[PDB]
């Protein structure tokens, strides 16, 4: 169970998905197309 | 591929593969049925010979 962890802007949360484009999924973090995990994302404007 | 990402290109190519694989199954099944008919004719020709 590999748990990756980071922060991103809100209009780019849709780019954390298998096979996506845009300046996060191209070269910051690329999910494979053989994906079987679970992407969890929540707002943290009250902290970060 | 030239105009589409892999996640979606695998689905589109899999559809074409299934279609053309069905073409081959149709072709080979008919050759077996038709080869039995020419074989029956060759048996008649050998018998007359």
Curated annotation (Swiss-Prot), chain A:
Q: Gene symbol?
A: S
Q: How does it assemble?
A: Binds to host ACE2. RBD also interacts with the N-linked glycan on 'Asn-90' of ACE2. Cleavage of S generates a polybasic C-terminal sequence on S1 that binds to host Neuropilin-1 (NRP1) and Neuropilin-2 (NRP2) receptors. Interacts with host integrin alpha-5/beta-1 (ITGA5:ITGB1) and with ACE2 in complex with integrin alpha-5/beta-1 (ITGA5:ITGB1). May interact via cytoplasmic c-terminus with M protein. May interact (via N-terminus) with host bilirubin and biliverdin, thereby preventing antibody binding to the SARS-CoV-2 spike NTD via an allosteric mechanism.
Enumerate the residue ranges of region (Integrin-binding motif).
9-11
What is the role of this chain?
A: Attaches the virion to the cell membrane by interacting with host receptor, initiating the infection. The major receptor is host ACE2. When S2/S2' has been cleaved, binding to the receptor triggers direct fusion at the cell membrane. When S2/S2' has not been cleaved, binding to the receptor results in internalization of the virus by endocytosis using host TFRC and GRM2 and leading to fusion of the virion membrane with the host endosomal membrane. Alternatively, may use NRP1/NRP2 and integrin as entry receptors.
Q: Which residues of the full protein are shown?
A: 395 to 442 of 1273
Q: What is this protein called?
A: Spike protein S1
């Amino acid at each position: 169970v590999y748990a990756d962890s980071f922060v991103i802007r809100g209009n780019e949360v849709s780019q954390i998905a298998p096979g996506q484009t845009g300046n996060i999924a191209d070269y910051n973090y690329k999910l494979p197309d053989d994906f079987t995990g679970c992407v969890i994302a929540w707002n943290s404007n009250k902290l970060d | 591929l030239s105009r589409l990402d892999p996640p979606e290109a695998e689905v589109q190519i899999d559809r074409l593969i299934t279609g053309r694989l069905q073409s081959l199954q149709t072709y080979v099944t008919q050759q077996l049925i038709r080869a039995a008919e020419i074989r029956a004719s060759a048996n008649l020709a050998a018998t007359k010979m």
